[PDB]
């Protein structure tokens, strides 16, 4: 909320890769590991 004043750079779920590695993760999500759901392309599946 209010950040503590020690934000001087000079002198929980695991984090999520960014940049090129995120494009790697989307490629291997969609096309390397194709999830065959009911004959269609279901992104974000629930309990089914």
């Amino acid at each position: 909320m209010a950040k503590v004043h020690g934000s001087l750079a000079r002198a929980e779920k695991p984090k999520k890769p960014k940049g090129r590695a995120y494009k790697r993760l989307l490629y291997t999500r969609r096309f390397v590991n194709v999830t065959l759901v009911n004959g269609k392309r279901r992104m974000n599946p629930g309990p089914s």
């Binding site: 940049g19 090129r20 590695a21 494009k23 790697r24 989307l26 490629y27 291997t28 969609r30 096309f31």
Partner: protein, 185 residues
């Protein structure tokens, strides 16, 4: 009061924001030649649109006027200097048939990986951007290099780089110092 420094855009956004086939096509390209954005596809499509506009307003006029042979052979000489257009296809019609992949495999991003200097395409991305692999005598940290033909048979690791010789890096001599003081104690 100066000459204003000229500046121009280089990418061009698509007209429709959301369609599935075009999005899947860029994500296939960006996963398989190892890019980081869609902007590296938008720039290449804008360059393709520029060379196709040049070929189109070349092609509508009469043959054997010297403007046509001048601009056309200069354009296709520049395109065969990169190697986007192959040597058997030397007509202005076959420039107009060319596509995005044919610009896109001539990056340094790709022809480090195709030349056997990296294990992955993103391993080629990391071994360019961390100042390791030089085009002859020039260190680059740039994957968008558009490798020429005569510069293709000069690409190896940099003399400054640990893979190309010299002393090792900071992590290696740091751990060498760690086992050095471990063996000393």
């Amino acid at each position: 009061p100066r000459a204003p420094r000229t500046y121009s855009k280089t990418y061009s956004t698509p007209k429709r924001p959301y369609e599935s086939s075009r999005l899947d096509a860029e994500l296939k390209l960006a996963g398989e030649f190892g890019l980081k954005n869609k902007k590296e596809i938008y720039r290449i499509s804008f360059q393709l649109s520029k060379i196709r506009r040049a070929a189109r307003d070349l092609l509508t006029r009469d043959e054997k006027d010297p403007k046509r042979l001048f601009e056309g052979n200069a354009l296709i000489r520049r395109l065969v200097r990169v190697g986007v257009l192959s040597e058997d296809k030397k007509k202005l019609d076959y420039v107009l048939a060319l596509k995005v992949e044919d610009f896109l495999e001539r990056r340094l991003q790709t022809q480090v990986y195709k030349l056997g200097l990296a294990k992955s395409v993103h391993h080629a991305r990391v071994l360019i951007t961390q100042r390791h692999i030089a085009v002859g005598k020039q260190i680059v940290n740039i994957p968008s290099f558009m490798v020429r033909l005569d510069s293709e048979k000069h690409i190896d690791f940099a003399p400054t780089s640990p893979f190309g010789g010299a002393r090792p890096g900071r992590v290696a001599r740091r751990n060498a110092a760690r086992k050095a003081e471990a063996s000393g104690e």
